[PDB]
Design a protein around this nucleic acid. Sequence first.
RNA 1: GAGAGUUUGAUCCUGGCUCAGGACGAACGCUGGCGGCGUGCCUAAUACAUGCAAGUCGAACGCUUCUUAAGAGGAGUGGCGGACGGGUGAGUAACACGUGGGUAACCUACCCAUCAGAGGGGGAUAACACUUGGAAACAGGUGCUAAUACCGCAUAACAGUUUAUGCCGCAUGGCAUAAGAGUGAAAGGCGCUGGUGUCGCUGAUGGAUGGACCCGCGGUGCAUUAGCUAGUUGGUGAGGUAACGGCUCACCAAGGCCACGAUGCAUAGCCGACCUGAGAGGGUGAUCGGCCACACUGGGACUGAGACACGGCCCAGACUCCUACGGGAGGCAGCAGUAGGGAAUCUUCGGCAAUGGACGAAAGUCUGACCGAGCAACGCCGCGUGAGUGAAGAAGGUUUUCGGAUCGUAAAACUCUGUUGUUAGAGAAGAACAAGGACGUUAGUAACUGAACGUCCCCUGACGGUAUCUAACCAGAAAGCCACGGCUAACUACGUGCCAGCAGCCGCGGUAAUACGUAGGUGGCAAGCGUUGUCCGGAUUUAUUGGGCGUAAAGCGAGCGCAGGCGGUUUCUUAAGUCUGAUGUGAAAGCCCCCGGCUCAACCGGGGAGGGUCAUUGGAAACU
Lengths: 80, 81, 200, 134, 87
Amino acid sequence: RNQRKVYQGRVVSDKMDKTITVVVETKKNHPIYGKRMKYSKKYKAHDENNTAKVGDIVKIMETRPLSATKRFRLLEVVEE
Amino acid sequence: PNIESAIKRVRTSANANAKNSSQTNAMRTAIKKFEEAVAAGADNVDALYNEAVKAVDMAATKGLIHKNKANRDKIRLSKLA
Amino acid sequence: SRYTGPSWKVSRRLGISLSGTGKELARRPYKPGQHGPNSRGKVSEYGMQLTEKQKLRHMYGMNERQFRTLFIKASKIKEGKHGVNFMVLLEQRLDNVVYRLGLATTRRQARQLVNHGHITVDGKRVDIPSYHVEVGQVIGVREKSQNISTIKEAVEATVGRPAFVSFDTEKLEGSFTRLPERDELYPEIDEALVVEYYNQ
Amino acid sequence: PTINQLVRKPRKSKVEKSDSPALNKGYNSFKKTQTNVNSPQKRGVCTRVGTMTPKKPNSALRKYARVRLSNLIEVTAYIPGIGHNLQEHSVVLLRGGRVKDLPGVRYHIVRGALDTAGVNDRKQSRSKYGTKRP
Amino acid sequence: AVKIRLKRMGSKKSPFYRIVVADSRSPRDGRFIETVGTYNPLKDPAEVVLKEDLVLDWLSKGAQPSDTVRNILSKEGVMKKHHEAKN
RNA sequence: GAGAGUUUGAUCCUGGCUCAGGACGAACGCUGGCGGCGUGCCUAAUACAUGCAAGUCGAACGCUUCUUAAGAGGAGUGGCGGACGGGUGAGUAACACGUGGGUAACCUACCCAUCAGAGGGGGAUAACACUUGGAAACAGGUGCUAAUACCGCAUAACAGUUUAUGCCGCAUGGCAUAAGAGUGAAAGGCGCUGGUGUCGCUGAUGGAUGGACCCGCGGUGCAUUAGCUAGUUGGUGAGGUAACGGCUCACCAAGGCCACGAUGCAUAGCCGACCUGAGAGGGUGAUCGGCCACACUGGGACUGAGACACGGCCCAGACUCCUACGGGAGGCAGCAGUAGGGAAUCUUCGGCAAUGGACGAAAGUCUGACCGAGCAACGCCGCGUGAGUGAAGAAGGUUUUCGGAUCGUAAAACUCUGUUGUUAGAGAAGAACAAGGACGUUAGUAACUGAACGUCCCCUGACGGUAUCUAACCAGAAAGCCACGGCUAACUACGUGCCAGCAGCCGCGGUAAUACGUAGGUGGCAAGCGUUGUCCGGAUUUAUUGGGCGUAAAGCGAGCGCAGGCGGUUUCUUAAGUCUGAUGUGAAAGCCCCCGGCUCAACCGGGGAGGGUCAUUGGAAACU
Ligand SMILES: [K+]
Ligand SMILES: [K+]
Ligand SMILES: [K+]
Ligand SMILES: [K+]
Ligand SMILES: [K+]
Ligand SMILES: [K+]
Ligand SMILES: [K+]
Ligand SMILES: [K+]
Ligand SMILES: [K+]
Ligand SMILES: [K+]
Ligand SMILES: [K+]
Ligand SMILES: [K+]
Ligand SMILES: [K+]
Ligand SMILES: [K+]
Ligand SMILES: [K+]
Ligand SMILES: [K+]
Ligand SMILES: [Mg+2]
Ligand SMILES: [Mg+2]
Ligand SMILES: [Mg+2]
Ligand SMILES: [Mg+2]
Ligand SMILES: [Mg+2]
Ligand SMILES: [Mg+2]
Ligand SMILES: [Mg+2]
Ligand SMILES: [Mg+2]
Ligand SMILES: [Mg+2]
Ligand SMILES: [Mg+2]
Ligand SMILES: [Mg+2]
Ligand SMILES: [Mg+2]
Ligand SMILES: [Mg+2]
Ligand SMILES: [Mg+2]
Ligand SMILES: [Mg+2]
């Protein structure tokens, strides 16, 4: 069975019911000068029970669109 | 139109539209009667449910609606019962 | 386009004998025109590079575009000196092959025979003077054209042939048995200067 | 600069500009706007034909034409060669090219094109000056 | 439907064809699903190169040979193998 | 991986400017022989005369008009096609595109494969016949008539859902089985002998194809643009879709986005690729292929498997046109062509033979796709415009220091050649076919006709008497353009005297100018040559590769500090970065590499390689 994309990130907003905003924080090399630059890609995840709190590390897996901007599902709470 | 077949398609599509919309309205009325029966709480609600299910499936035949469109109605209709 | 002008004035512009005999440089071994006999300023290095390049393409009677493209292909040869490999490809030109085998006294004559269709490659007629001849291919005169004074004079007139050529004076059929080595071609031509010319 | 600076503010190069800007702009009659179309030449009408003076080292009576182009731009152009048949309201074809003597002249008039005649008596470099082989 | 058909190639007055599996609606020289052979008609005995397993696989899937490609497949004997596969 | 000129009296440095190269859908000027191949509105997505660009089926159905009842039409109904092919790039910075994934949120005519059905009825309707109105478009009225047109009833749950079990996943869930309730289809045509062949018809499933949606990453300028957002962000239900979803709605919250550049503005179809460069890069996005978008401007839906549909409908608008003034008609960014714009881009051609597409059982019909031909040196490639011998070197031109130089072995002369050209002749491939006539083999059948396949006979060329070949005849008809002060290869005479003119830069011209104009020479390239425009190079002149800031341009007047960037030694650990292996994929064409085909080359064909800061997975662990 094929697999979806799972990313590790940090909760930066839980002021919305059943949803969290996550930040993945990868690093990319500059196309010209080659230096590694910090890059933040943040996602909206459907929190089943508003479990994960702000400033928490959480794993999210991709899913079908759950709302206008939701595309991901909370999987694990790795750190509180 | 300019092409003869296009001229003929105007007539045939117009005729198809009249038939399609009449039969579709029939399906909507059949559904409408059943739903209104449920609101009133009638006695023959069973017959109207069957006719509502009959109308939707017959509409799926003739392809006035899609099979999935029919299935969603049938599930919805049954819930109302 | 072919150059059909006077031949001597080309050799004395280049300071070499394009026919390899010297009759062009015997009298008035200086450039053509009224300014020839008397003294002029030193040629620039660009002029030195220009004249060396013009030596070769005048030697084999080619226009500049064809000369450029052949020089480009000679670069693609991975092994060997760029300039040397270029000189070999000029020699393998069907024009030159006809003249080397002795079927014509001059390269213009060799080109005239190839162009007009008197020559056959591996028994098959080829009328392209630019045609590139592999080692071992047989170059012959057309069966209708074997009895023309011009080739027969050339066949008997030429008393020497390059070591890299096989020839049969009866069949009028010859072939290069291997590539020419640099020393076998014109030593007076400095191919290094040509390479640097097109390098600019 | 450090690498981080170049990441923050990358290198940026000077933008070049045309020597002959009036040839870079077309005109759309409908929208009444100027299009950016690179054209090797442009037709115009001579609003004024006369003579001009050079800058300090040189002295002559250089021949120009004040040409209003088909793109509505107003340009000063030079009439090369000896003698010309241009007059005001003539249709002339302009090519690029400054004239170092004349400060405001950035275009030359093409000889032998449109109303411009070839140069009389010319015998060398005829393709310039637009004269047929004698 | 899916066709096994010829895509024209070569130069003017010197046609060369690739045998391709393509959707019927795609342009003749345009989109195609897969190349399965070549067809050189300028040769007095026509030269054909064929990936027979590829062709045989597509025929089993319902691909419809074009008129000339069907002849090409018969000479190479593939149309016989497909007939025996259906049996 | 080449450099040169130009700041000074001279110098070194800094520094700009300029030039030598390549390129092009070019244009222009001069010139112009041929052939192969390719290319040809870049501007006004401006307006468009005329012809053509989609039709097909009588083996679905009923009429009608002829042919001496055959054959041939003519319009109906009905089916399929018309959403492909072709054009354009206006809009679009947007999951549009490119690349990598996901869908357990999807649909799919025609084509294959399987398991089933294909039973009984019915009422119509054009065509037609009369007839009403109308200028015309076209509408109606009454009376008939058929179907594979339409509609019921019947029979089908293998579909969906519910439930019970088992198995399993990534949360919603997925798969199979079993039951259970409610309902749902259809059509006949041709031909052999009620049975049966074959093409169609209905239900379900799987394939293949095509489409749809979601997501990571990637490719423009401007903050002298920082705030934006209110179905907006999320939820709960409902409704809607093929499908998930604020897709819509009613409610309940209030969020969402943004200096990692939101929003706004400007510009732009994107890509494979193409030009350039030593490369890193820069520029471009013609032709060819893929994707997207649009079709007079705006909006809408209908029909359909599929369109919100270039040559369909409706409405509105601007424009052109026809009216009998009541009302009608139209949309070349299809192929040609015209007008207009412009520096500037083609014939109102032949054919469907080939290949591909639509319809048909097929013959076949249709196809401005496409094959061809025409026009243009617009580009690339090939070949010519002759070859050999030929004077201490004719005449003539130019010039002399008047001796001679030079144009010049050039010419002449003599001997040759026929690529070409002309004249006659000889003549391709490109065709494979289909259909049809023979037999044969399989599966099936009571037997068949036929189906699938195999083998033979027969059958078709727009190009076009084209390429090509052969023979005869004559060098006879077939070269120019620019440059020559330095850069920069090539020099002298006159004429002119800061004039006339040249010029890319430096600069030339003021009465003895290799720089202006002519001539003779000469150089470069050559059916071209030059000029202009545009891009890359040279330019290390934005420097990542690859520069600088005491006095040449350049250290903020100085501190304190948020974010950010960077950061001492070491054990274990991890492994995001980094390195590495495998697999998947990065279409075809193109450059490149081999290999073949065209007499060569261009060009064509075959086989590779390359190309990702790609994904999945296994490794390594110094460095961050
Ligand atoms: K029809
Ligand atoms: K100076
Ligand atoms: K300099
Ligand atoms: K259709
Ligand atoms: K994507
Ligand atoms: K909702
Ligand atoms: K566009
Ligand atoms: K539109
Ligand atoms: K249409
Ligand atoms: K055809
Ligand atoms: K027609
Ligand atoms: K055929
Ligand atoms: K000069
Ligand atoms: K640097
Ligand atoms: K300071
Ligand atoms: K690691
Ligand atoms: Mg040429
Ligand atoms: Mg000049
Ligand atoms: Mg053949
Ligand atoms: Mg256009
Ligand atoms: Mg645009
Ligand atoms: Mg029916
Ligand atoms: Mg029923
Ligand atoms: Mg460079
Ligand atoms: Mg049209
Ligand atoms: Mg001939
Ligand atoms: Mg010089
Ligand atoms: Mg001069
Ligand atoms: Mg640079
Ligand atoms: Mg100072
Ligand atoms: Mg300073």
